[PDB]
Design an enzyme around this catalytic site. Structure first.
Site, PDB file in Angstrom:
ATOM      1  CD  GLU A  68       8.753  -3.467  -0.974  1.00  0.00           C
ATOM      2  OE1 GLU A  68       9.411  -3.867   0.011  1.00  0.00           O
ATOM      3  OE2 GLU A  68       9.207  -3.380  -2.161  1.00  0.00           O
ATOM      4  CE  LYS A  90      -0.966  -8.743  13.656  1.00  0.00           C
ATOM      5  NZ  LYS A  90      -0.430 -10.122  13.570  1.00  0.00           N
ATOM      6  CE1 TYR A 138      -0.231 -10.193   9.197  1.00  0.00           C
ATOM      7  CE2 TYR A 138       1.633  -8.905   8.447  1.00  0.00           C
ATOM      8  CZ  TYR A 138       0.281  -8.997   8.739  1.00  0.00           C
ATOM      9  OH  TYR A 138      -0.570  -7.893   8.604  1.00  0.00           O
ATOM     10  CG  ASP A 183       5.758 -11.266  -7.207  1.00  0.00           C
ATOM     11  OD1 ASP A 183       5.955 -12.247  -7.977  1.00  0.00           O
ATOM     12  OD2 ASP A 183       6.508 -10.972  -6.224  1.00  0.00           O
ATOM     13  CG  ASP A 211       8.606 -16.834  -1.070  1.00  0.00           C
ATOM     14  OD1 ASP A 211       9.077 -17.868  -0.519  1.00  0.00           O
ATOM     15  OD2 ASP A 211       9.162 -15.719  -1.108  1.00  0.00           O
ATOM     16  CG  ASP A 241       7.303  -8.214  -1.925  1.00  0.00           C
ATOM     17  OD1 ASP A 241       7.626  -6.977  -2.034  1.00  0.00           O
ATOM     18  OD2 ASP A 241       7.970  -9.171  -2.451  1.00  0.00           O
TER      19      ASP A 241
END
Ligand SMILES: [Mg+2]
Ligand SMILES: [Mg+2]
Ligand SMILES: [Mg+2]
Lengths: 360, 360, 360
Positions: B54, B110, B112, B152, B156, B174
């Site tokens: 990540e 940040k 969003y 991925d 979403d 992500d």
């Protein structure tokens, strides 16, 4: 002795608030670990001891400046660990400033290819696993013979040389939590609860975690590394370490029946060895010297010694040892055997033979 | 580097068994994501790798404690993703305890405004949709150039900055499933079927989902994010993602005739780009560097380049690129163009020109 | 938290295209409802919100995976309903695959013996019916107290525990239509006509069905479950639900004179309560907290409170409340009283007293 002037630095391997490791070479197969603030004015004794302990396996010390009394006391109270193929190679230790680019402690080491947990991300041969166990045991036997306890054995800081990836060389590293005092050896008076007990971690042995403080009230570490080897033997044969995870045995509770069974691939004798090591009571566990012999005997004895059968003679044993000395005169295989012959005393090889017979 | 001491927390943004995210500020436009049990003792390596992954887009790393070997091996085996306007901004990564109000991994990011599926709850301009697609492509081009695959991508987790809601800024976020290894790049040996293959999800590309395991037997990810972009382009132009829903195309089955025709509102060239990206065979799909260029040329080229007509000259192209640089010396429009000029190599802009000509 | 590994399934209780409910037990007094395709990639948000809403009464949540952003957005916008004897017991909710025998939502619940309509297939005691009505009211008072509206109360989903069939325990179940948002509580902006308004069904309250949309234009649900309770009270006292059947009053038309008279067996005070509840104007209806007290006072007050007579003292009320607390230290009877004492505030128990006096 080698100092900074003899060597050339490369890319950093690791950086931190407390120090830095650089790749290095002589003029990049070396690593030069630098720990900052090796100064009684910038850190307390607990932290300085921990920095010095990392140096327990070192082959040469070199000092630019006049040693401070605290440095002197540290050195004169410390058991030294002689070289051994299964202990990390630390070629030089020196003290020096952050010029030459904080008094800083410096350790020049061999660079290793990876740790054990990385090497086990892909399942190795069942034969590879027995060599790994054997080397790990052989390192523990060498520390215990010289009155030193690592106290922080784990997958993470067993380091491998993976030339010939079918059989790697394993070394024990990161001696920052070790017991290595000339005064008390492996038995440590335990009077206050706020006392350095090794890594306060998952693989501390039951006889250390469970002990209540008092007036001697001793902590005995003579079989404590061995317990952690037992846990680690799981990882070495492809299973979860029973004492790591979210659904997780704990060193102080675990009942011996809670321990998972090992895969059928892993020999019966070896399963028993692992089960022995993981006995809560240290008196029930093998001597390190004997446990190491078990793995070696499994690897190299005449097959008649391993099958139930079996006449074992003091003269025949010495003959067998000598057959082994000639056999080594597949680099790991050589190392283990020489490592085994270096310490083979006749008493303990029979002890190990007798133990193997009783577990079939 | 920024650590907890420099910033002030607010309301939770998200709460879970595995971690928490908090709104935050410096002294609430930051998010501080905290993932628990970043410890080899409390979780296995596959989970820890996923937590570290990540971190691949991070700008700075900071460590309080001395790095454990697994942390070091993770860091040194990882490809880094340099900053880019269309990749999520992660300003600091640090390791820390669950005090400071479990060893926990921390990511300061940040905040969003929303994700792409929320923004597309009302249909946007057809111009806005092209800017969205260009940004997405430009992000994937940046990843692939640096040997990283998201694995991925989905509505979403594409995140938007909706100041100037006629033209938002999109970012890929992500990176938990990403491939980012120095050793193997975008080619990944696939020997066991029980292996991490990315998100085992709807928008895995046909060349990944259909591959059976073996002995190299390699998974090639070099055009796999691109396939997902194709599916997502539908959502971006107000249609159902062909590969989502109860009556649903499947990555492994779908034949190229089964794909819904896009609305007439979406330019013909762009329809073709989407049809290219969604080709089953990665050898039939454009390079990312080229596919990103197709969208950029549609957006900013001289109109003569787009109509059938057409004399195209190496010197004229360069003149045009230099006309663009001056033009940027409507914040999304600036970012895209500068994004495009940064990577423009003359070979690839002609390739893209040639591709547009052949599809009318 | 309980997950699948802790429990053993038995016979299906129900099967469908969208999911399954299995009888279950820990090692068959539980039910494990499984709803399939709890994945934004296999269903639209509308359908996921409805699956998630079913989880509003749940005592514990557990998640194997990292929560997706739509999951997160659901959770953070949702009001939680604390446990209550008259609200369905859902012990765990977990997300998991359709293996281990589709991402699927799992709800582990108590098994109940029947629904209200089945139980009323034979006429119960007039006393049994008052206990029923009281429990129903008590459930509604709990929901409204925590800013939640069920929006689909009906005989079909009031569920009963029928040990001691003379007095059963009633629970409100199936929260898939419920309003439970942190942001707006029981007032819901109603800007479009195509908007989720609860079950679009027979027992929607007059203030909800009759409202035209606009710009706030707010749907107020604070007395809307109460209205349904009124209708259902008819079923509880052996009559047809006035709003069910082929010759059938409608929630938007019905004049208050059109309501059938209740049987003479049902107390006059209780007839008035029902009539109050079924007033078209929510402002003329009792607060749920007060309505619930009316039924409780009927059941447990000193007889002098109920007959016209009557000196009522703040100190005497408290004394009576404490007499009740001692009386519970006939399991439904215990539950009702504890439920009433838990929420009894002095102001509202006088409001209820006063209302009883004025209706004789
Ligand atoms: Mg001096
Ligand atoms: Mg250390
Ligand atoms: Mg993730």
């Amino acid at each position: 002795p080698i100092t900074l002037n003899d060597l050339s630095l490369g890319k950093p391997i690791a950086k931190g608030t407390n120090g830095v490791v650089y790749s290095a070479k002589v003029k990049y197969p070396f690593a030069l670990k630098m720990m900052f603030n090796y100064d009684i004015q910038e850190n307390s004794m607990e932290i300085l001891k921990a920095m010095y302990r990392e140096t327990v396996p070192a082959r040469m010390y070199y000092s630019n400046h006049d040693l401070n009394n605290w440095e002197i006391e540290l050195a004169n109270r410390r058991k030294h660990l002689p070289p051994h193929p299964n202990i990390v190679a630390i070629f030089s230790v020196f003290t020096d400033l952050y010029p030459a680019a904080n008094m800083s402690l410096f350790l020049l080491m061999k660079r290793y290819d990876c740790n054990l947990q990385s090497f086990l991300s892909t399942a190795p041969s069942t034969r590879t696993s027995l060599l790994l166990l054997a080397q790990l045991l052989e390192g523990v036997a060498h520390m215990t013979a010289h009155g030193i306890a690592h106290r922080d054995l784990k997958s993470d800081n067993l380091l491998l040389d993976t030339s010939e990836p079918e059989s790697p060389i394993l070394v024990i590293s990161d001696f920052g939590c070790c017991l290595a005092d000339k005064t008390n050896g492996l038995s440590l008076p335990y009077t206050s609860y706020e006392m350095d007990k090794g890594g306060n971690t998952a693989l501390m042995a039951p006889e250390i975690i469970c002990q209540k403080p008092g007036t001697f009230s001793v902590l005995n570490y003579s079989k404590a590394d061995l317990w952690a080897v037992g846990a680690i033997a799981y990882e070495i044969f492809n299973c979860h370490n029973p004492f790591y995870g979210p659904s997780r045995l704990k060193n102080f509770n675990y009942k011996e029946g809670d321990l998972p069974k090992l895969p059928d691939e892993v020999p019966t004798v070896i399963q028993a060895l692992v089960a022995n090591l993981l006995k809560r009571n240290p008196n029930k566990r093998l001597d390190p010297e004997v446990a190491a012999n078990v793995c070696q005997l499994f690897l190299w004895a005449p097959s008649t010694w391993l099958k139930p059968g079996k006449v074992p003679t003091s003269g025949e044993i010495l003959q067998w040892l000598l057959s082994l000395t000639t056999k080594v005169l597949t680099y790991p295989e050589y190392l283990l055997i020489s490592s085994f012959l270096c310490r083979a005393k006749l008493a303990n090889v029979r002890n190990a033979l007798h133990w193997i017979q009783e577990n079939l």
